[PDB]
Amino acid sequence: MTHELISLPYAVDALAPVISKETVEFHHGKHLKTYVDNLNKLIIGTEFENADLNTIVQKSEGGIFNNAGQTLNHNLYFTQFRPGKGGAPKGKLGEAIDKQFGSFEKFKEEFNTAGTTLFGSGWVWLASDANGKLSIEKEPNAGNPVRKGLNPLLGFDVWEHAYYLTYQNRRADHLKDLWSIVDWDIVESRY
Amino acid sequence: MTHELISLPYAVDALAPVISKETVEFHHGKHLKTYVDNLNKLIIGTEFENADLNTIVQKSEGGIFNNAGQTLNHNLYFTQFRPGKGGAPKGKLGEAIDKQFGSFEKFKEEFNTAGTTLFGSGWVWLASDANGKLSIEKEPNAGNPVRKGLNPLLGFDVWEHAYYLTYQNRRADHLKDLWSIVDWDIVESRY
Amino acid sequence: THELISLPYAVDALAPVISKETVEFHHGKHLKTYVDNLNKLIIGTEFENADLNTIVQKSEGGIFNNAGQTLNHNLYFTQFRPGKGGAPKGKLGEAIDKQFGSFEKFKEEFNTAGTTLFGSGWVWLASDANGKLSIEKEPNAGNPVRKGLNPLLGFDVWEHAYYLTYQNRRADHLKDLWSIVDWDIVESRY
Amino acid sequence: MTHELISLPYAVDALAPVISKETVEFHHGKHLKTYVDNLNKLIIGTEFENADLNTIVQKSEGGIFNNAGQTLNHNLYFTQFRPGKGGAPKGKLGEAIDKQFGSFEKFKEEFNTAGTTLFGSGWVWLASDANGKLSIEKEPNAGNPVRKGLNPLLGFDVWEHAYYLTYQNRRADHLKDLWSIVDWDIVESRY
């Protein structure tokens, strides 16, 4: 079986200046493309050869997991952003964030802090369980909450390639700027 | 007339990371407010009391010119930017830039270079004469091309307060980044 | 070949008037550049082996900009010391007093001059041959030695000198500077 | 004790193009400075306030360890390079390599492979034990062989910030180019 490189729902420069055209090209066209190609080559002749992506992330180990996890991570990452959006979440998700975190602003800083204190490469995930309970997951390297049976809602990539060309060492500034391009209509639909 | 501090056509954090929320707050909320306040003070009891800003900039000198010039400069500066824009110019302007500079990319390095070589405080302006001929004007301090009878189209502020909080001494990096927030629709409309 | 002067104090010694981050950028990046540029530009010119003062006195354009800024900062950074301030004594103390009326009066005029300078520049306290004092407003890279005067005390009003801590509050910064001025060093220049 | 930011034994642009002037400015001037500043702040009032770097790396945990390990890692990193060097090792070290590795070229490929396959952020270290035995240690994130009682000889930084501005995703290319700027006289002196 074969996994495909996702098509971006927007132009490569649609997310500037928070995510530059150059970053999109490298992040999507080089990094993600590599994870997809690796995954495809590594699952041949294995029990994951014909499994759906989520099943692979939940059960694989080693190189297969690293590539499958990164593939799922970026697929979700790239499709949750849209220019001219941002703002705050409404409806179901919006209510749960206030109840569990007190307010959207309070949740944002906890999210940002989680992403900033994650040492090295990794991901910060907003996830939920079957009951709708929200949690903030700090996932080192290729980690994803589906491995814990959780539902990944919003993920911020803190691997340096996600922001280096524009922010260099200023990861904190990048995380606070990312909220401006989050399409909550897409995120709410994952809840 | 009473010159007013213009309202921003976007949110204070809309131009991050090229121009951060803090910088917009000080640049617009503090520096520009001071120029407007000083201008309103100095023209009292003078031939400029009831003149429009453009006339003041073309005919004044000394303190009146310094504040009038900075007011006009910043009013044009802040209104020319937008997030999710950038790119290249189109229409006659884009056409004129190619015809007169060879290409947009050549225009940029030439504009960037003028900005980086300006010693001290100043502005670099893309201006047009009555026939649509373009020129790059290096303006020390509060200078503006309208003083030469030209039409100011796009201006980059290289006073250190425009980029210090984020870039410190790296003026060149700041200039390179500015292109990503230029709303060419607005600039084309001035042509 | 000119060198980047060595600070006679720790980088965080002048905080908060001049923060640790500012000293690092002002001295470690800005001054270094003016020096690296001055060395480069004078190579193969009549100023290749002249002394800094003569360069600032005869230079033009690029060479002068970097020369004036190097001399300017050299006197700037070396005129401060933590826990000093106060008032001037001896010769200079009497001069200022006689020529300005009082020290408070002088500080006032000096602050106004610095707040008034539009754009980038330096406000300088200079002295002529007969020890007559004058407050010189120098745009950009200017320095009183150009006019054949003796530079005693200079405040850097380029925005990079205070923006990290004071942003647009230049006046507040100039009022605070007096607290870290080492008058003993200023007297030694008069 | 207050740890200092090490002085570079060469110009900031001496290592270009393998390590650009900008990468040195960001890598040494921003990343290393932050790790040092952070370390100095965290150790105050702790059992490590007066301890030497190696001791801190060997016994500390959490944030102190992360910053101390990165400080030690980078100090050895920046000092082992010199323009106009490279080549192969000689002496007791050049001998030990050829011996337990086959040849310098065979050690190189092995080292390169270690660095390219380390997933996420980390360091690849050539370490020596008490008897002079050589080993290639893959250290994730802030790891250093000193923590294991070994002697660090040559370390390549594979955190993306070490090569992204110039190589972007091409880590393998960067590791290949690193050999050209290694000063074996320095390395040899550590054995």
Ligand SMILES: [Fe+3]
């Ligand atoms: Fe990524």
Ligand SMILES: [Fe+3]
């Ligand atoms: Fe400005």
Ligand SMILES: [Fe+3]
């Ligand atoms: Fe300065």
Ligand SMILES: [Fe+3]
């Ligand atoms: Fe590093």
